């Protein structure tokens with residue numbers, strides 16, 4: 001009949017003195033060693049229940065999926081979202097908007113053919129862009145992010161952005177800037193002291209201008225769609241949401257208004273871009289550090305696909321090792337370590353612990369991906385974690401970078417496709433060369449907070 005144990009919290013500051021804001025994951029894992037896998041931390045005034053290891057996260061988010069179905073809080077993001085949009089909402093907003101969004105993604109591709117060809121075409125444009133560097137030593141960041149973003153930008157804006165559009169570069173800078181901030185010390189300090197810091201000068205204010213610029217843009221692209229709309233023929237996601245908005249103009253109790261559109265669209269545009277981009281950027285660094293994996297990936301491509309035709313999604317089933325590399329890239333990468341905070345919808349009983357209504361939950365996706373029970377060498381990049389003795393692909397229940405449950409990533413279909421069609425096509429046409437010897441390439445993250453971000457590196461893409 002008691003809430004999980006945890007260190008003694010001082011008023012307002014919580015467990016600030018017992019935690020390091022630069023390495024929140026390490027700080028929570030140190031406390032897991034004393035108080036067990038399910039403990040209570042006070043991030044300032046924010047009472048949070050932290051779940052560590054697979055069993056804890058799965059038991060809570062899957063077995064008791066309905067009880068842990070509520071959405072928590074991410075203070076930097078909730079500065080511009082304020083509970084609006086598909087991602088940061090609860091109840092009838094999170095049920096209506098999650099329903100509409102998954103639907104409106106299938107009717108414009110996602111998981112089908114309409115998006116597979118659209119990703120293949122875009123993959124062919126990344127090939128051009130990298131062949132256009134003439135094998136010069138470059139920063140892959142914006143080359144990869146440009147490609148990735150255009151896939152989701154097709155669904156939400158109608159068409160793709162052109163690689164030279166300076167507003168596009170500016171929007172991608174905004175997306176990288178916030179994923180950088182929320183992963184820094186000041187970003188994680190902001191999760192504790194948002195109520196004060198929101199009004200104080202600093203790095204939090206610059207990050208806000210990045211979110212405002214992103215919101216300003218979506219509102220601009222929505223207004224255009226309004227005065228140029230075809231009510232019987234929707235061009236994109238904004239257009240389909242604009243149809244429903246009118247079919248609800250008579251319902252005062254609707255969740256389909258202008259504010260929820262600007263937000264749902266923004267949330268997707270960022271959530272589709274920066275997540276898959278970070279995974280790609282970390283991926284190529286992991287491959288340069290390990291030539292042996294690149295070589296076997298190359299062997300599988302030469303054998304299965306060839307040097308001619310552009311790889312297609314269905315080739316994945318005839319390609320076991322490749323799927324295992326992408327899986328280990330996502331695992332080691334740990335793109336979003338502490339998920340996107342959950343909240344218990346009603347008073348719960350979880351393993352002899354009481355969690356009152358409204359209690360924020362932190363599912364540590366990283367501790368599940370780095371679980372020593374489900375993985376042989378959780379600290380190393382070794383695709384064999386997802387590969388049995390006969391070289392076949394082996395699944396794992398601890399593989400959760402997309403999370404699990406009732407509020408999981410409904411962009412998993414698009415994300416896994418993008419990663420297969422971008423990694424493979426680049427690996428077929430190009431061989432990777434670093435700037436330094438593989439024994440020196442640092443694979444440890446530069447920042448770990450909301451997101452896990454790799455180090456700033458440079459490389460060259462040489463043809464085959």
Ligand code: HEM
Nearest residue numbers: 087271272275276335336340401402403407408409411415
């Ligand atoms: C490698 C890529 C990706 C990773 C690691 C990832 C990660 C996550 C995670 C950890 C969550 C929270 C799940 C939870 O409730 O516990 C989430 C939410 C979500 N993701 Fe992704 N994601 C990825 C790609 C995508 C893509 C491609 C899209 C866009 C189509 C997207 C759409 C969203 C949305 C809209 C949510 C909120 C769902 C809800 O509140 O019901 N994600 N993502």
